[PDB]
Subunit: 267 residues, 2 copies
């Protein structure tokens, strides 16, 4: 350490990531331990076994360990105190996301099911390969390019495209049916958390584009490199369920993906 | 069915995570600092500096540990200790709020542009600028029992368990007694509660490692004593600063017993050693 900002100066109170950190503290007090899951257990019990099986592929998607931590290292190493302050709320959010799904699986009795079997090739290419490789790269390579790639795979694709669509899917299937109210309450808290996360992704990608516009084009190319595995995983889930409007859900994915591109401007 | 569950609900560090969530909802943005600002204004310029060395110690220290906890969370996730990692997210968020609280107090009392670094002497720099980050960053390449005990000893048992605990006692002994800085002390009391969980994580980490090989207990003691000369060396310098700017003690009829505080620092240090046993 050469020195410390809160000794020489203050926190940059006007920094957008400090203002995002404040929002996270106000809006992130929810606790998975407070959610009533007893109705969810009775709803899963009340399902024929045909209906129990059809829910597992989508739930299997969410069963995927502080994925953002290397970004917190890289940005701390650069002296971005406000970002680090925000990223402590990002990490705690993700601990609560693992907690909520774990508790819900326990309540409905599938926490010991090996849900891995519903991860096809395209899923694994995103969650087993591109996400951890892009984030871990940042411990050795913190370049403008490496940071945009990390934020694209994780914040714009994994959170901003796939998770968003999964949450919308959960409301479209179960909220309408009046099923699984504890799960849906959890989903709504996760969806609010993930909004701040996507905003950190957008801000990170953009303060870089405000440097050099060549990177805006890296952003699009990286977004486009991953698209075949987003839609390839979506199609596999579509196929399994048909064996609930699957064509408006595939359209929501496409909608979300192009909407992520539009939140980064060239100027 | 057929696989192990994701989370061990009974693990001691999951229990600690659940308490951090329940007990850790305070927000520095809620603290009323308007009486502090009025208290600081009314001080003579001699009285406006007797508190600043300690604030300097805490602002930097809280900043340092916010940056420097990240390797421990890396190492423990790599060892598959999911429940520890869940707990360490509350630990990390706690420390960001501690840095926030101190910066807000500096900002509110009008000293936001003042460079408080000058109150970091040589021994302060050797712990917070130097030994803390080195021990923690080591865990990126070397996550052995030995490296983990050293990190948890410098961070939890010395920095939190000795220096910070003693700093909080100092604050209550001088400013709570005088009725100064009511917002700062409200923060102090919040920080003190959080830090109980942080020391407990250090105790549990250090102990689970000693329970495997007893040779590590002795490493622990040696690391504790290696750090002591810079602990007491920083404490002696702050003592020297207070004895020389006695105007705020005079004004508020405070008998500041610098030897009582020095004994508290010695107590805390011997007490952190005692909370680790050779056997178990
Ligand atoms: C069954 C209908 C299929 C159509 C909708 C497909 C979208 C589902 C996406 C589920 C994957 C979400 C993965 C969680 C990401 C994370 O770890 O934050
Ligand atoms: C005159 C007696 C001096 C007593 C010692 C005072 C110590 C000052 C505080 C500096 C340490 C702060 C470390 C922060 C710990 C954390 O944020 O986890
Ligand atoms: Fe997220
Ligand atoms: Fe395919
Ligand atoms: Fe602490
Ligand atoms: Fe000395
Ligand atoms: Mn999440
Ligand atoms: Mn602290």
């Amino acid at each position: 350490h050469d020195g410390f900002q809160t000794v020489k100066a203050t926190i940059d109170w006007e920094h957008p990531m400090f203002k995002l950190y404040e929002k996270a503290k106000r809006n992130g007090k929810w606790n998975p331990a407070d959610i009533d899951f007893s109705q969810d257990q009775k709803d899963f019990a009340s399902l024929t076994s045909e209906e129990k099986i059809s829910a597992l592929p989508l739930v299997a998607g969410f069963s995927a360990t502080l994925d953002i931590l290397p970004m917190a290292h890289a940005l701390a190493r650069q002296g971005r105190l406000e970002d680090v302050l925000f990223l402590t709320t990002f990490m705690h959010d993700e601990a609560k996301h693992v907690e909520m799904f774990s508790r819900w699986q326990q309540a409905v009795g599938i926490g010991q099911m090996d849900l891995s079997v519903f991860h096809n090739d395209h899923y694994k290419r995103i969650f087993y390969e591109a996400l951890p490789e892009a984030m871990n790269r940042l411990y050795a390579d913190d370049s403008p390019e490496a940071v945009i790639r990390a934020a694209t795979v994780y914040n714009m694709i994994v959170e901003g495209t796939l998770a968003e669509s999964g949450y919308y899917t959960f409301r479209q299937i179960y909220k309408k049916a009046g099923l699984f109210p504890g799960l849906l309450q959890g989903i709504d808290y996760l969806n609010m958390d993930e909004g701040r996360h996507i905003q950190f992704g957008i801000y990170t990608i953009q303060r870089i584009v405000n440097e050099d516009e060549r990177y805006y084009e890296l952003f699009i190319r990286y977004m486009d490199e991953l698209w075949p595995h987003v839609i390839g995983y979506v199609d596999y889930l579509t196929e399994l369920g048909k064996r609930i409007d699957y064509d408006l859900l595939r359209h929501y994915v496409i909608k979300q993906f192009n909407l992520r591109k539009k939140q980064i401007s060239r100027t």
